[PDB]
Amino acid sequence: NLYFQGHMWVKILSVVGARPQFIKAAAVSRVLRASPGVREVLVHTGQHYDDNMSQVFFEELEIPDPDYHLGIGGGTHGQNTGRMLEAIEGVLLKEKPDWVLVYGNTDSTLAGALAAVKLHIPVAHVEAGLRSFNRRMPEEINRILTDHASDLLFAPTETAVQNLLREGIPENRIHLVGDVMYDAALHYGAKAERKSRILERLGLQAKGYVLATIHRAENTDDQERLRVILEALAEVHQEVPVVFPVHPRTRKRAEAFGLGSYLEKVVALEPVGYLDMVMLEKNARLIVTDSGGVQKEAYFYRVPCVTVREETEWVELLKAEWNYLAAPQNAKDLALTILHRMRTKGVEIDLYGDGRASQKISDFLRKVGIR
Amino acid sequence: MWVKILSVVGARPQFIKAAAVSRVLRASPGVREVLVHTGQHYDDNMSQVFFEELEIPDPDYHLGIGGGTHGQNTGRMLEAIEGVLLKEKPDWVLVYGNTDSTLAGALAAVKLHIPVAHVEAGLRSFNRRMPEEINRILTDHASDLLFAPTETAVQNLLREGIPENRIHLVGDVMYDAALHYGAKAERKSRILERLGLQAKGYVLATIHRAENTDDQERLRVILEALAEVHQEVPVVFPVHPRTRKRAEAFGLGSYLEKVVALEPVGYLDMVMLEKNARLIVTDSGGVQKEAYFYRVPCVTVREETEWVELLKAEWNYLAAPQNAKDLALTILHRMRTKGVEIDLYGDGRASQKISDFLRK
Ligand SMILES: CC(=O)N[C@H]1[C@@H](OP(=O)(O)OP(=O)(O)OC[C@H]2O[C@@H](n3ccc(=O)[nH]c3=O)[C@H](O)[C@@H]2O)O[C@H](C(=O)O)[C@@H](O)[C@@H]1NC(C)=O
Ligand SMILES: CC(=O)N[C@H]1[C@@H](OP(=O)(O)OP(=O)(O)OC[C@H]2O[C@@H](n3ccc(=O)[nH]c3=O)[C@H](O)[C@@H]2O)O[C@H](C(=O)O)[C@@H](O)[C@@H]1NC(C)=O
Ligand SMILES: CC(=O)N[C@H]1[C@@H](OP(=O)(O)OP(=O)(O)OC[C@H]2O[C@@H](n3ccc(=O)[nH]c3=O)[C@H](O)[C@@H]2O)O[C@H](CO)[C@@H](O)[C@@H]1O
Ligand SMILES: CC(=O)N[C@H]1[C@@H](OP(=O)(O)OP(=O)(O)OC[C@H]2O[C@@H](n3ccc(=O)[nH]c3=O)[C@H](O)[C@@H]2O)O[C@H](CO)[C@@H](O)[C@@H]1O
Ligand SMILES: [Cl-]
Ligand SMILES: [Cl-]
């Protein structure tokens, strides 16, 4: 035996529930699965369950079948989170992992953190420390409580680091690693370029359209806010075609509120896969969204962005002038704002790291040691 | 115009706090209170006895959730509490202390955008293994109003970036309760008579922290320490059912027969035992304050406490359970001590301060 023979396994269990969590997990899981002395276990809470919200990401992003599908979703915050909490705990007692990874800030994120910390299993938070400072948002609650329940905090931004320090989280548990969604954009771009012909199937050409997505509860749960958004987009479409993959939350609200006819006024799609989405974003003249990740991706592709919200967690994008908030207060103004910004670019700047946040995270999990 | 306050209570120390605050809210103009009992504590001697002897109004809801894991108790409470909130739509949800019930109620509420107010906010053990440290950090960070009992708790909240306009130093509602119920206790408690004890003729012990009961070696040290003490001065020991169950589980039941072990007692009986003890040994949060209220020296069987002013003032002493004999001696040696004269925890109107803030 010449070389040193290591005898130590760590079991890392990831908890995912929703579309953006599968994307982040695809970047991180792949590095962990390739890491010596790492056994990864993946739990799918069931929060997102339609194939174009879940299965399609497992296919295109090459994620192994979850070890557990919990089958929980569609309910209230109370039912989803409550049921996930108890179910995730069951798994934890079975699998007895050394670390629990949770991602972003869905109800699934919070359920996993809570299930784990009370069993004294160390929680690590991928995308830690983002603040909208708007507690009406369920996502803000989620990230605050998850962060304060975590033993490791993988911040993507300096602002995120500052947020955590300001809430008394000790500096030694915080690591600025950048953003794994940039890793993912880099890792899957060639496959998107190879495999999507969404542009060919919509008869669209590069820079000849605007891409839009809207699903924030505060935008969809209010009939008249939603109307401002659908009406604005419809106005924009007369000037530049608007492509709009429509989230199931958004469709369900549009329907119940009777606003369905507005979707005839733009190029509305079922929700798309990541590969088609990359191609759509890459080639847009402008992106209008209330998504977190999409704001970032627009910048990756150096496409201008409008965020239809009263705030963003991703403030560096505003400072760099790649992003611009426009709250949905009236349709005329929203539309005018969109058309004006279609002519803009931000400044050249390198945000979100080197595309290897996944490797940093894996390295930090493996070397923390038994406290 | 009128204001609706829904209160969530699960366990014994929450009933006691609720009693103080309830009496004042109910009596207050422009206020309905709805009371939700999660079911976390359910034995008659941990729950009904408090409603009855403290004349707490019947809970509008009894969820009947208890006896399971953290994840079962909390996740079920979360769903069940939310259901009631959807029905009642209060202006404020009120939580107390730091049980699994506390967290479920806060979390149920904040996702419905109902303002949450934390009664007894900002206490910190800095021991993140305690399920109660997590409960309070998360509850505090989910709350809109923070009723701190001490300057330390104010400081703890500011250091975690919680804004000062949300923090009110109101003292301790458990002081209110002690003052209000003191006379009834005097009139109605016959527990000294029943147990054959004389005033200042025994030590009072309670023990129930998870780190003391789930850990066999810690639990053994404690029970062994108390049995040694009892040889010198009788030890009176109302045993938390968790503690009873863990002691039976680890085969330490016999130590309970070597002191004056009791089932858990009512508040009135407890006040009488506390008042008349030579010294109190506990790992309870509330009992360490109460010993101070009755100028009875306290020994706290833990590595830390949230109530650090009780150490500062020499009314309370830490004794971690490392060694049965070291613990027995520390207990016996603290018996004839006393702390300095100082007023902690306010004027006994913490509840009315609380009530005023809510109405305004
Ligand atoms: C506002 C907010 O809190 N957001 C949180 C939220 O994410 P988010 O708002 O980005 O959700 P979302 O837009 O559904 O997904 C985008 C992805 O879908 C792809 N995407 C989008 C549409 C589509 O049809 N196809 C497709 O592939 C896009 O290419 C893109 O890769 O949940 C996340 C999570 O917990 O992990 C948190 O990290 C977020 N926190 C932050 C701060 O961004
Ligand atoms: C350490 C810890 O986290 N503790 C938290 C915990 O309380 P605690 O540890 O005091 O539990 P506990 O000792 O059963 O009750 C004592 C009462 O029972 C009475 N008591 C006691 C024994 C008895 O037989 N009869 C009786 O009437 C006594 O007279 C006394 O009035 O739950 C509380 C809650 O969530 O509201 C938190 O505020 C506490 N946080 C703090 C910081 O003290
Ligand atoms: C509270 C929470 O965790 N919110 C997140 C959730 O929003 P999202 O709106 O998806 O939140 P939910 O998981 O509660 O789903 C809401 C509703 O969408 C419908 N539905 C959802 C999924 C599905 O596959 N099919 C379906 O029809 C159901 O009616 C369901 O009740 O995921 C988004 C990513 O896309 C995130 O940006 C949001 O932060
Ligand atoms: C996690 C949590 O919230 N812990 C609190 C809980 O501890 P406590 O130890 O009561 O915590 P639980 O509510 O989880 O109860 C633990 C176990 O005690 C037994 N049991 C409980 C209640 C009852 O009426 N009968 C019975 O037998 C059950 O086996 C139960 O499973 O209440 C204490 C008040 O006394 C508080 O100091 C603790 O902070
Ligand atoms: Cl979307
Ligand atoms: Cl007890």
Author numbering:
A (entry chain B): -6 to 364
B (entry chain A): 1 to 360
Please quote the paper that reports this structure.
The final step in the pathway is catalyzed by a 2-epimerase, which utilizes UDP-2,3-diacetamido-2,3-dideoxy-d-glucuronic acid as its substrate. The focus of this investigation is on the ORF WP_011172736, which we demonstrate encodes for a 2-epimerase. We have also demonstrated that the T. thermophilus enzyme is allosterically regulated by UDP-GlcNAc. Whereas the sugar 2-epimerases that function on UDP-GlcNAc have been the focus of past biochemical and structural analyses, this is the first detailed investigation of a 2-epimerase that specifically utilizes UDP-2,3-diacetamido-2,3-dideoxy-d-glucuronic acid as its substrate.
Given the unexpected presence of UDP-GlcNAc in structure 4, we next conducted crystallization trials that included both UDP-GlcNAc3NAcA and UDP-GlcNAc. Crystals were obtained at pH 9.0 (structure 6) and pH 6.0 (structure 7). Both models at pH 9.0 and 6.0 were determined to 2.2 Å resolution and refined to overall R-factors of 19.4% and 17.5%, respectively. Regardless of pH, each subunit of the dimer contained both UDP-GlcNAc3NAcA in the active site and UDP-GlcNAc in the auxiliary binding pocket.
